[PDB]
Amino acid sequence: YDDDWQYEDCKLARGGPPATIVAIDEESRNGTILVDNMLIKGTAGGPDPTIELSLKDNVDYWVLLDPVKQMLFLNSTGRVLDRDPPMNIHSIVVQVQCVNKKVGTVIYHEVRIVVRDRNDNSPTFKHESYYATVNELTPVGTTIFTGFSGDNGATDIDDGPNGQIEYVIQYNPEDPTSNDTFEIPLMLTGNVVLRKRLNYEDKTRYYVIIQANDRAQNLNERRTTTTTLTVDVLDGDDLGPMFLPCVLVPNTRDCRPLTYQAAIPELRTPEELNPILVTPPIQAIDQDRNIQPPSDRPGILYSILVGTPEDYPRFFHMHPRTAELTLLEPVNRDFHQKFDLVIKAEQDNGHPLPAFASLHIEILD
Amino acid sequence: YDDDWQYEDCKLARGGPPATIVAIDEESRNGTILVDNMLIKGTAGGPDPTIELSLKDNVDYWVLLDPVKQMLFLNSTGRVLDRDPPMNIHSIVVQVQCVNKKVGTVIYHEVRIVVRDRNDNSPTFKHESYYATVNELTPVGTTIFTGFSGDNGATDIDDGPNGQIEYVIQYNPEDPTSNDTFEIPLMLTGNVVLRKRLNYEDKTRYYVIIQANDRAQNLNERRTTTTTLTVDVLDGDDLGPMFLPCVLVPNTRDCRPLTYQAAIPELRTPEELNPILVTPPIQAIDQDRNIQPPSDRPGILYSILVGTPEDYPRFFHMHPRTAELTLLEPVNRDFHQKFDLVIKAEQDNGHPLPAFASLHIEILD
Ligand SMILES: *[C@@H]1O[C@H](CO)[C@@H](O)[C@H](O)[C@H]1NC(C)=O
Ligand SMILES: *[C@@H]1O[C@H](CO)[C@@H](O)[C@H](O)[C@H]1NC(C)=O
Ligand SMILES: *[C@@H]1O[C@H](CO)[C@@H](O)[C@H](O)[C@H]1NC(C)=O
Ligand SMILES: *[C@@H]1O[C@H](CO)[C@@H](O)[C@H](O)[C@H]1NC(C)=O
Ligand SMILES: *[C@@H]1O[C@H](CO)[C@@H](O)[C@H](O)[C@H]1NC(C)=O
Ligand SMILES: *[C@@H]1O[C@H](CO)[C@@H](O)[C@H](O)[C@H]1NC(C)=O
Ligand SMILES: *[C@H]1O[C@H](CO)[C@@H](O)[C@H](O)[C@@H]1O
Ligand SMILES: *[C@H]1O[C@H](CO)[C@@H](O)[C@H](O)[C@@H]1O
Ligand SMILES: *[C@H]1O[C@H](CO)[C@@H](O)[C@H](O)[C@@H]1O
Ligand SMILES: *[C@H]1O[C@H](CO)[C@@H](O)[C@H](O)[C@@H]1O
Ligand SMILES: *[C@H]1O[C@H](CO)[C@@H](O)[C@H](O)[C@@H]1O
Ligand SMILES: *[C@H]1O[C@H](CO)[C@@H](O)[C@H](O)[C@@H]1O
Ligand SMILES: *[C@H]1O[C@H](CO)[C@@H](O)[C@H](O)[C@@H]1O
Ligand SMILES: *[C@H]1O[C@H](CO)[C@@H](O)[C@H](O)[C@@H]1O
Ligand SMILES: *[C@H]1O[C@H](CO)[C@@H](O)[C@H](O)[C@@H]1O
Ligand SMILES: *[C@H]1O[C@H](CO)[C@@H](O)[C@H](O)[C@@H]1O
Ligand SMILES: [Ca+2]
Ligand SMILES: [Ca+2]
Ligand SMILES: [Ca+2]
Ligand SMILES: [Ca+2]
Ligand SMILES: [Ca+2]
Ligand SMILES: [Ca+2]
Ligand SMILES: [Ca+2]
Ligand SMILES: [Ca+2]
Ligand SMILES: [Ca+2]
Ligand SMILES: [Ca+2]
């Protein structure tokens, strides 16, 4: 038991916890009052003080004390009280030491100054730009970009909601359909989902403007940074062959074929006549003009699909890769005056998507 | 300093660490020798022993001691020394207590029996079966199933390689193309990737047999469990309309249209004649017969694409949704004897994939 602790000098004349806890905003002005009055019993002033007050553990001298008023001030001339990196000052803790002069006892009064975050930083993207490719056959609802994952996206150095990031697509006045074609359903991840079906024939590149905004409680205080995600559409196999030559029908993408022509002298043999010349030459090309890589491009199979009269298979053979037409036996014109055949060109990859053209063959007297 | 510790009795007559460390396989027989000889100096036998030996900390009585031979045995009658759950006995630790009888000193000799894992457990799948759906337009290389993720896959309760799981596709003799169509490139995840392009018209369900095997060092000792991943293909919009009626060309999927027919009496007015009857009625349907959901199904647009003579737009109008044909002005047969028109039916969804049919119109005297 000690009689020296029975005094009230050096003890706090307030309710609450032993620590004196206060809060100020980061980056507060020099001279900002931290504690207006410590409320420590006793007097440090006068010619016969009963107490002596001083600061201990005043790291980097952030706090100044007036021992008579028992007032603490922020010392920040020439510097900034930054809560964010690189400083990371989330609180300032110091001790007010009080000595009771009558008996020499010492008491420390902790002071904790909580430094409140301001939203003084904007999101920064890891990269200057972002890029994705998407095959045009990709179904709607496919997640086509995850490139903000694993901190490759945006970071904000503020605390709490001030540092939380939401990714949102903006309307792009320079590419008005991009915000209709793509969506970010989960703001917290920034992953981009295909919202509308693509068509390589119509549009092959999109500029998707993606903002990253912080979540400050006050909308007027939120900060925003933008990036562009460039999406290139890759040509997919949604179209089949088209015969050449063709004429485009005005106001359409339908390039219609001609009727191919051939003529066979009656009674001459295949040895004499083959190969049978067709005018213009039968050819077709894939309406998908930029399939990559080249090894994914299909071959085209040519055939005589149907024809009139229906005995044409007795007389004609078409090479399936070259479309070369050969005669199989001599033609007696008493029995066979002409043929009208339908030629098919289709892909050899299980997705035939055929085109059709007519071939007229005259038998000559 | 104590003279009582200057004796060799109760100390180990061997090199190595203070703990006596040995290993046995899990599930070892009752009576399995754990330590053949503790090598403790002194004699516990005879009528004047210099030491006394006993076991301490013998949890659940797994160890038996012969104090004279200094031999330890496994006590496992009626039970199993299981290293795996539910027992989880990875080691057995007991103390051999030695008392030096001349001076009463006590020394404990730790014995650690490491229980080695056997590969006595097979992988178990969380679920009886697994299921995925895949739109047929999905590009090759798409990861189409991740359903083993987050422990929804297979678990093995053995330790180390004995408990590691590899997921591998097996050839399915009941569905021989499924192991060609899908692949698991990362054995450790079991995620399934589309390896070959789908076609709903050809195949709509696959049974993919997926084994989960453990990684026991000896192939003969590895354990395997199988599951089936059922994959259903969803019909996608890769095909356009087809006109009806049609006749299928033998050995093909090409259902060719007829030439539609109409006849218009000369000089009668549109009021008198409309609508112009076409035989058979012009109709088309989507060659994709099971697009889901119904709201994704496109409408069909009908039009007169081209025609001869080329003044037909002065005379005829086709309703784009119903294909109804109307006359726009009376027809003078001195100037117009017949028309041969090409009708197009295409989808209205930006992927027209058109079909074409002929329409012959006679002007009647
Ligand atoms: C900074 O604040 C302290 C405390 O009020 C004050 O003593 C000092 O004069 C101030 N310095 C300047 C340059 O204003
Ligand atoms: C105020 O802070 C600055 C920087 O730490 C320091 O140089 C100065 O000595 C401090 N002033 C006082 C009165 O503690
Ligand atoms: C895209 O931006 C425009 C203009 O702000 C807006 O009308 C439209 O609703 C947006 N589209 C989507 C899918 O949000
Ligand atoms: C089990 O093993 C111990 C130690 O060898 C032995 O004493 C005991 O007889 C054995 N019990 C049976 C039932 O074999
Ligand atoms: C052997 O283990 C069983 C099960 O713990 C126990 O009942 C028995 O008492 C033990 N025997 C000895 C000799 O310790
Ligand atoms: C599928 O299984 C068969 C038979 O084992 C085998 O020939 C074929 O190579 C396998 N396919 C793939 C893609 O591994
Ligand atoms: C693609 O993946 C994202 C998640 O990364 C989903 O949000 C989306 O629905 C799609 O499955
Ligand atoms: C920055 O600006 C964007 C709009 O461009 C807001 O969404 C955000 O709240 C912040 O004010
Ligand atoms: C991201 O995009 C927005 C809108 O174009 C710009 O305001 C910003 O400067 C950044 O380029
Ligand atoms: C990203 O880049 C696009 C142009 O490529 C801009 O329009 C946008 O403002 C952002 O800087
Ligand atoms: C997406 O990336 C392209 C370059 O690949 C840029 O041109 C565009 O501005 C956007 O950043
Ligand atoms: C789908 O996603 C898996 C990983 O989950 C990849 O292994 C695969 O290449 C594809 O991108
Ligand atoms: C179980 O059986 C499979 C083959 O079906 C092996 O891959 C595995 O090593 C284990 O022996
Ligand atoms: C998984 O599939 C394999 C092969 O069909 C079977 O052997 C096993 O019983 C399980 O059904
Ligand atoms: C999974 O299920 C299929 C049949 O649905 C079996 O063939 C296979 O053996 C496994 O049991
Ligand atoms: C995949 O799932 C189907 C049922 O949806 C089963 O029929 C098949 O055996 C496999 O387990
Ligand atoms: Ca700051
Ligand atoms: Ca801040
Ligand atoms: Ca911020
Ligand atoms: Ca294409
Ligand atoms: Ca193609
Ligand atoms: Ca076991
Ligand atoms: Ca085991
Ligand atoms: Ca195992
Ligand atoms: Ca389809
Ligand atoms: Ca369709």
Swiss-Prot record, chains A, B:
Tissue note: Expressed in brain and sensory epithelium of the developing inner ear. Expressed in the retina, in the photoreceptor inner segments, the outer plexiform layer, the inner nuclei layer and the ganglion cell layer and, more diffusely in the inner plexiform layer (at protein level). Not detected in the retinal pigment epithelium (at protein level). Expressed in the spleen, dorsal root ganglion, dorsal aspect of neural tube, floor plate and ependymal cells adjacent to the neural canal.
UniProt-annotated glycosylation sites, renumbered to this chain: N30, N75, N179
Domain of life: Eukaryota
Residue ranges of every copy of the Cadherin domain listed in the record: 18-125, 126-243, 256-365
Compartments, as annotated in UniProt: Cell membrane
S-S bonds: C10-C98
Domain notes: Cadherin repeats 1 and 2 mediate calcium-dependent heterophilic interaction with CDH23. Three calcium ions are usually bound at the interface of each cadherin domain and rigidify the connections, imparting a strong curvature to the full-length ectodomain.
Disease: Defects in Pcdh15 are the cause of the Ames waltzer (av) phenotype. It is characterized by deafness and a balance disorder, associated with the degeneration of inner ear neuroepithelia.
Assembly, per entry: Antiparallel heterodimer with CDH23. Found in a complex with TMIE and LHFPL5. Interacts with LHFPL5/TMHS; this interaction is required for efficient localization to hair bundles. Interacts with MYO7A. Interacts with USH1G; this interaction may recruit USH1G to the plasma membrane. Interacts with TOMT. Isoforms CD1 and CD3 interact with TMC1 (via N-terminus) and TMC2 (via N-terminus). Interacts with PIEZO1.
Role summary: Calcium-dependent cell-adhesion protein. Required for inner ear neuroepithelial cell elaboration and cochlear function. Probably involved in the maintenance of normal retinal function.
Protein name as annotated: Protocadherin-15
Species whose genome carries this gene: Mus musculus
Portion of the parent chain present: 28 to 392 of 1943
